[PDB]
């Protein structure tokens, strides 16, 4: 019933069965192949009007409902072009697919405000994205566009508004031997289906996640809300180490910095305020994006958690 109820669908694993919407397109095709190579259970996909074909040796369906019923998929990943992406997400929501990952960059904001409106009034479907790299449970399930080889199954949960910055954090935590429990890229758009607190909740309750890296950047107040969530849920008696890096310290105000949601507007959304809010929530903020791995490593050492 409540959207926060679908939070748990974020935790993909070796049992997650995935279909691709926008399956026959160039992007859907390419990442589907990488997904199969990785071992992800990609079981088919949809492309309206091309149902009844196979592609990459898998069944193609005209609708998400048919695909879901015929394969038992519990997740959908969307690579549909922007003009149709909101319809793609709505179709998945109507089909009650537990988890929808919308990779698509470029969806109109107005389109997402509408999608989010339906989204918040149901609890069957959890949406991550749009404009996000996806989610990955190292060695078990990869849904999205991240390079699979830099990941190593381990102890750090990573949530991030940025794809490439996540690859930095994974590469670094893999080098220090900590590895990653689950990596979630919530994307760079202003209106999206999953924020940091959604992921933090999963991470704080996850026995496998012993530490958390939170990666944010300018714009909105998702980081500040995450600091509130942590002050309430991670400040004792329970306390997992949380390290963060916030991009955009030097960004010029008023310009969309690549990401549609990366903008300091009305003097709101600056980096310093996000850093300050996190520090006060117990988060150790690494000022350098090259030091996330070593920073969380020392936190573990301090706590004698190595």
């Amino acid at each position: 019933c409540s959207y926060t109820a679908s939070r748990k669908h974020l935790y993909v694993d070796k049992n997650t069965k995935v279909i691709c919407q926008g399956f026959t397109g160039k992007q859907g095709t390419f990442h589907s192949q990488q997904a199969l190579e990785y071992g992800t259970n990609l079981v088919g996909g949809t492309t309206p009007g091309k149902g009844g074909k196979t592609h990459l040796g898998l069944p193609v369906f005209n609708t998400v409902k048919e695909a879901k019923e015929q394969t038992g998929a519990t997740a959908s990943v969307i690579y549909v072009p922007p003009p149709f992406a909101a319809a793609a997400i709505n179709e998945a929501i109507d089909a009650e697919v537990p988890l929808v990952v919308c990779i698509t960059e470029g969806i109109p904001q107005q389109d997402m405000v509408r999608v989010k409106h339906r989204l918040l009034r149901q609890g069957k479907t959890r949406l991550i994205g749009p404009n996000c790299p996806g989610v990955i449970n190292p060695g078990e399930c990869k849904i999205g566009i991240m390079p699979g080889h830099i990941h190593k199954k381990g102890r750090i949960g990573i949530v991030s508004r940025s794809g490439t910055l996540t690859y930095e954090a994974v590469h670094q935590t893999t080098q220090v031997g900590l590895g990653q429990s689950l990596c979630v890229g919530i994307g760079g758009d202003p209106f999206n289906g999953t924020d940091f607190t959604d992921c933090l909740e999963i991470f704080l309750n996850d026995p496998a996640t012993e530490g958390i890296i939170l990666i944010g950047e300018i714009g909105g107040n998702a980081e500040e809300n995450a600091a509130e969530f942590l002050k309430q849920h991670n400040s004792g008696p329970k306390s997992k180490p949380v390290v963060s890096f916030i991009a955009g310290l030097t960004a010029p105000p008023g310009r969309r910095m690549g990401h549609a949601g990366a903008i300091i507007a009305g003097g709101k959304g600056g980096a310093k305020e996000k850093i300050t809010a996190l520090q006060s929530a117990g988060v150790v903020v690494s000022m350098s994006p090259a030091q996330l791995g070593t920073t969380i490593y020392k936190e573990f050492e301090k706590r004698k958690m190595l």
Binding site: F30, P82, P83, G106, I107, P108, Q109, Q110, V113, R114, K116, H117, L120, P133, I145, M146, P147, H149, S160, R161, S162, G163, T164, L165, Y167, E168, H171, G188, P190, F191, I215, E217, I218, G219, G220, N221, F245, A247, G248, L249, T250, A251, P252, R255, R256, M257, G258, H259, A260, G261, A262, G266, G267, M287, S288, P289, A290, Q291
Partner: protein, 394 residues
């Protein structure tokens, strides 16, 4: 972002039922004349159309002072327009030599008996459109928020149900419109909201949203920010985009679909990824350098994008070094290393390159970069890259 001339956003508003000053745009002194006549107005405002601010106290190269003139006489509008069109208008906000004025707006001059602030924006925090208004008009809404938060009013609008009469009336009342004027303003609010939805605006800000002594509710001035993602369905509006006042490189980068933002530094940089690009700009500053620009090649990291990026950074004479940091994207590193050394040779760049490539085929990538004979330093990680790029410039 999309940049509209005053006459263009006012046309947009008037074509959509929103009340603005009546006006015409003129190309010639003569058209300015006939337009002033057609208006049939007691008083006329002649305004040069340039995007920069400070028009009022700017100066034309014809010697004419002021980019905004008032007059009751149509023929003066013609004479003044003749001293504007084709000349350069310089203001405290344009380059030194001013901006060529190709058009003037001739509008009826309305008195403003009351000024309020009205805005409609997509608010991330409210998951939707919010109506923001203040009785305290004509001022930057931020100042008003600092000094008097109690005077800022917000109505979260439900995107599915639309704006409610009740909401529009309440806002009009909150902005202090009274009697018949409250219904007129409530009505203008509904038309602004529809306009906001129709053109895929992320924000429509009317300041002042006000009334004239003759009891009219008018959007005297407005600024509209458009959602770039909606371009495919707002083609006519984006076409009106005036790029005549943008930094050339900014424009060039856009031809080739690149997110380029100039800064004042000397260390150029390109990265695939908005986050990583911001982080690179950041870590260069943390390490004591000044980034020359923000440039996101995106995650789809193509060889031709790398090449175009180099072509772009060739235009900036301040660049003393380039930090290339690529990690991610479906294209292996060896292909990226190739486009880099090819770009270098063919565009004949002579500045040092600090390169950080991480991903598939890094070994071969490192080989291609090493055997290129080019002044290329291969960095260990991002911090190393920043320190080395900073060490490479004055």
């Amino acid at each position: 972002m999309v940049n509209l001339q005053e006459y263009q956003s006012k046309k947009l508003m008037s074509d959509n039922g929103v009340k603005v000053q009546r006006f015409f745009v003129a190309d010639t002194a003569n058209e300015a004349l006939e337009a002033a006549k057609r208006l049939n107005a007691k008083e006329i405002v002649l305004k040069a159309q340039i995007l920069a601010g400070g028009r009022g106290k700017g100066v034309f190269s014809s010697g004419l002072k002021g980019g905004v003139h008032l007059t009751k006489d149509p023929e003066v509008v013609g004479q003044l327009a003749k001293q504007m069109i084709g000349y350069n208008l310089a203001t405290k906000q344009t380059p030194k030599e001013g901006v060529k004025v190709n058009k003037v707006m001739v509008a009826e001059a309305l008195d403003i008996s009351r000024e309020t602030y009205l805005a409609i924006l997509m608010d991330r925090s409210c998951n939707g459109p919010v109506l923001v208004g203040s009785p305290q008009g004509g001022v930057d809404i931020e100042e008003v928020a600092a000094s008097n938060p109690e005077l800022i009013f917000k109505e979260q609008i439900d995107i599915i149900e639309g704006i409610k009469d009740s909401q529009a009336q309440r806002m009009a009342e909150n902005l202090g419109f009274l009697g018949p004027l409250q219904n007129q303003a409530a009505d203008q609010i509904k038309k602004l909201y529809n306009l906001f939805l129709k053109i895929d605006a992320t924000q429509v800000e009317v300041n002042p949203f006000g009334e004239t002594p003759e009891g009219q509710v008018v959007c005297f001035d407005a600024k509209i920010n458009f959602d770039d993602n909606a371009e495919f369905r707002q083609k006519d509006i984006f076409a009106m985009d005036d790029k005549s006042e943008n930094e050339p490189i900014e424009n060039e980068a856009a031809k080739y679909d690149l997110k380029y933002i100039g800064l004042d530094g000397n260390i150029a940089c390109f990265v695939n990824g908005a986050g990583l690009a911001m982080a690179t700009c950041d870590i260069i500053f943390l390490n004591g350098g000044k980034p020359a620009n923000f440039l996101d090649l995106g995650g789809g990291v193509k060889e031709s994008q790398v090449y175009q990026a180099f072509k772009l950074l060739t235009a900036d004479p301040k660049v003393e070094a380039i930090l290339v940091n690529i990690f991610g994207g479906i294209v292996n590193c060896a292909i990226i290393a190739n486009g880099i050394t090819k770009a270098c040779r063919e565009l004949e760049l002579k500045v040092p390159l600090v390169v950080r490539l991480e991903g598939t085929n890094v070994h071969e990538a490192q080989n291609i970069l090493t055997n290129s004979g080019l002044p290329i330093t291969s960095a260990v990680d991002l911090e190393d890259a920043a320190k080395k790029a900073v060490a490479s410039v004055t």
